[PDB]
Amino acid sequence: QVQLVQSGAEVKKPGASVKLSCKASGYTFTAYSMHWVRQAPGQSLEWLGWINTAIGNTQYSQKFQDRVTITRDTSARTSYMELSSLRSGDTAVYFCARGASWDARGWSGYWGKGTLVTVSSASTKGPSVFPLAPSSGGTAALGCLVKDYFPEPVTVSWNSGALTSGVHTFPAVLQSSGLYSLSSVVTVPSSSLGTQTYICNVNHKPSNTKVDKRVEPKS
Amino acid sequence: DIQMTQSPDSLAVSLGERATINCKSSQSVFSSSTNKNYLAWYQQKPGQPPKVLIYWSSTRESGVPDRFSASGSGTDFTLTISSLQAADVAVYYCHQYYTAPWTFGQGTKVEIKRTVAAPSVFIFPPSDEQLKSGTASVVCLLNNFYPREAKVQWKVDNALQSGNSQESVTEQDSKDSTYSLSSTLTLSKADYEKHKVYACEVTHQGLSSPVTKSFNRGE
């Protein structure tokens, strides 16, 4: 059962370095090449380079020969990619992927789940949660604005999981501040407003923030 | 290197109908020595890593359903999903492995085509608790519309704004195949309590006339 387990998510500031790992199992490790490929958010896949797991020689993409080094530890069944002099533009998910042949001239038949790396000068911050208050077509929309946090991710549910129909939690956006902002809204019948309670459950694990905010109409 | 280029960038097809994606390589990825095309096709759903559908340009990976097939030679390639099911909604990448560096296409997003539906629009003024903090967030919600293209223009006292808004769009809805969009206009408390009329003008195919939703500061 071929498996690729990548290290956890990483947050680093500009000019620093990061070293990610990829632990393989279920196949003989020295018989297949290992590859490192990244993807900036909403962007395409970009190959960083590869290592011949038997010999240990590598080659990298020219846009990266300066800063990337790929490594393996054969008794560990493990690959390592180290990126240095990090910049915000290096914020991306970094995949390791096993080659189809020992030698790079082959596709990838197995990709690891990915490791997210965020490069920012921002520090850990928990969000402020503001109401998107309903206003008095037969249905209304209310929501929560989860604002000024770092880093990703945030989770939002409504009424502790009980309200799911009509919910739309949006992808976060990154503001000039370096901080993230997200909104989650739900359509509900106007008739419900004053009697049904609507609470949004926000979780920002990186800052240990758990927050429940009741949303009601404004006076 | 070898530039990979897909067409079209985005593709909308009806349930059960045919989907066709094209790949052109800047140079040939055929080896006369081995008689193979060094080309693969991958599927990618948000959050998840890529999964091979096809390798050697025309062989289907095991476990992949037979409605996928690919063809072409040398520099021209074509992935076909003969009869689109809901689970086929994803991004598709082509990939040459003829020579290092590995390169990929830019990606073709494939969605379910449906009848055009107009967005329900809602506007949300900043909460007072956010206003204590010195910043103002006005939010526009465009709910459950199709297709994805939508213009949101923020107007303050009718002076249309620029450089101070940010957008975010839902993934195609599994149930009704619509999209939803959230737009956030941001000012300092100062600028906010200086103008009166805040409006969101939406332009969409299903709206015969551009809809504006609005409020006067002080409801």
Side-chain angles (χ1 to χ4, degrees):
Chain A
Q1 299 181 340
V2 172
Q3 267 186 334
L4 302 185
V5 180
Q6 295 185 238
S7 55
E10 209 118 3
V11 177
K12 293 255 145 96
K13 43 189 208 195
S17 296
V18 66
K19 188 166 165 168
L20 308 179
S21 72
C22 178
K23 153 96 164 197
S25 67
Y27 73 96
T28 93
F29 179 75
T30 50
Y32 296 81
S33 50
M34 207 88 215
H35 294 261
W36 286 87
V37 170
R38 97 194 182 157
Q39 193 169 41
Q43 304 293 106
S44 189
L45 304 149
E46 194 169 23
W47 185 80
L48 298 160
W50 83 283
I51 182 143
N52 174 305
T53 54
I55 300 186
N57 59 301
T58 50
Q59 58 192 182
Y60 311 111
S61 155
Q62 196 269 330
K63 357 137 181 122
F64 294 110
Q65 266 177 2
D66 46 15
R67 316 186 280 134
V68 55
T69 78
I70 298 169
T71 281
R72 50 81 238 213
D73 186 327
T74 195
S75 45
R77 262 179 257 118
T78 292
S79 179
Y80 294 107
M81 124 65 169
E82 190 190 344
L83 186 54
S84 289
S85 155
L86 288 167
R87 304 180 276 269
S88 56
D90 290 320
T91 294
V93 178
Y94 292 72
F95 299 108
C96 74
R98 182 192 94 174
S101 59
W102 52 271
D103 85 315
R105 307 189 68 197
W107 63 96
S108 181
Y110 301 96
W111 297 66
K113 292 162 77 169
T115 272
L116 164 65
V117 174
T118 314
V119 183
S120 158
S121 48
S123 306
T124 309
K125 185 178 179 302
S128 293
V129 190
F130 305 122
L132 294 169
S135 77
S136 33
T139 68
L142 51 96
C144 271
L145 178 65
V146 178
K147 179 157 211 292
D148 288 328
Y149 65 84
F150 184 80
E152 293 261 50
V154 158
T155 39
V156 176
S157 60
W158 283 87
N159 294 343
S160 308
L163 182 52
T164 47
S165 273
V167 182
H168 289 310
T169 308
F170 293 93
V173 305
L174 172 60
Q175 321 169 108
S176 299
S177 57
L179 296 174
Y180 289 87
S181 207
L182 177 153
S183 49
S184 181
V185 310
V186 57
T187 41
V188 98
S190 299
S191 70
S192 263
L193 284 179
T195 51
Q196 253 280 344
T197 302
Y198 298 110
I199 307 181
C200 82
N201 323 107
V202 170
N203 240 276
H204 187 234
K205 282 165 181 157
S207 68
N208 280 295
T209 308
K210 226 148 168 189
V211 157
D212 296 77
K213 191 72 193 174
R214 189 200 224 92
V215 176
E216 285 172 348
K218 183 183 307 177
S219 164
Chain B
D1 313 333
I2 306 185
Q3 309 286 304
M4 308 296 290
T5 301
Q6 315 190 200
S7 196
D9 261 283
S10 194
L11 175 68
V13 281
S14 303
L15 253 256
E17 240 61 79
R18 215 234 260 127
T20 286
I21 298 151
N22 241 268
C23 195
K24 287 182 203 138
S25 59
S26 86
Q27 115 182 24
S28 182
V29 296
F30 177 86
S31 184
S32 56
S33 159
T34 60
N35 290 288
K36 295 189 194 115
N37 281 294
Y38 290 60
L39 192 288
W41 289 97
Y42 305 87
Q43 188 184 67
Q44 199 184 26
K45 301 198 173 196
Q48 308 188 357
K51 315 241 217 169
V52 254
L53 307 163
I54 294 184
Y55 56 77
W56 295 128
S57 79
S58 66
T59 306
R60 186 156 43 91
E61 161 73 14
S62 58
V64 179
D66 58 15
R67 60 174 185 275
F68 294 87
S69 71
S71 82
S73 194
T75 60
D76 288 341
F77 301 99
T78 290
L79 173 67
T80 309
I81 316 185
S82 78
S83 166
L84 189 82
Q85 306 293 330
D88 299 326
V89 176
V91 176
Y92 299 85
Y93 295 95
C94 65
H95 171 208
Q96 66 83 19
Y97 50 86
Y98 176 83
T99 197
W102 280 16
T103 52
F104 301 85
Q106 73 274 18
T108 300
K109 186 163 270 194
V110 166
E111 40 149 40
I112 288 173
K113 160 205 275 290
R114 71 176 298 296
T115 63
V116 354
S120 319
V121 191
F122 304 83
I123 188 164
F124 295 104
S127 68
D128 293 326
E129 38 178 316
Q130 174 197 179
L131 280 166
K132 310 198 202 84
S133 318
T135 41
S137 284
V138 199
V139 173
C140 202
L141 161 59
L142 281 64
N143 218 46
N144 295 36
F145 61 92
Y146 187 86
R148 156 177 278 238
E149 296 82 48
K151 170 188 300 185
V152 166
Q153 205 116 57
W154 286 100
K155 298 185 195 182
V156 179
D157 278 336
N158 240 61
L160 72 96
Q161 305 295 130
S162 172
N164 52 351
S165 39
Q166 271 177 318
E167 265 184 19
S168 170
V169 178
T170 277
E171 221 68 55
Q172 182 176 43
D173 200 78
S174 58
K175 278 156 180 198
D176 63 14
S177 316
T178 58
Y179 292 94
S180 293
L181 183 156
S182 161
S183 197
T184 299
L185 177 81
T186 285
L187 315 169
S188 58
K189 191 183 55 139
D191 296 71
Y192 177 72
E193 60 190 19
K194 176 181 303 200
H195 309 79
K196 167 177 167 175
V197 172
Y198 288 79
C200 187
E201 161 158 287
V202 177
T203 23
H204 187 262
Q205 272 172 248
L207 286 186
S208 52
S209 284
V211 168
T212 294
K213 245 90 182 305
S214 64
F215 68 87
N216 292 329
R217 180 170 62 76
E219 293 183 323

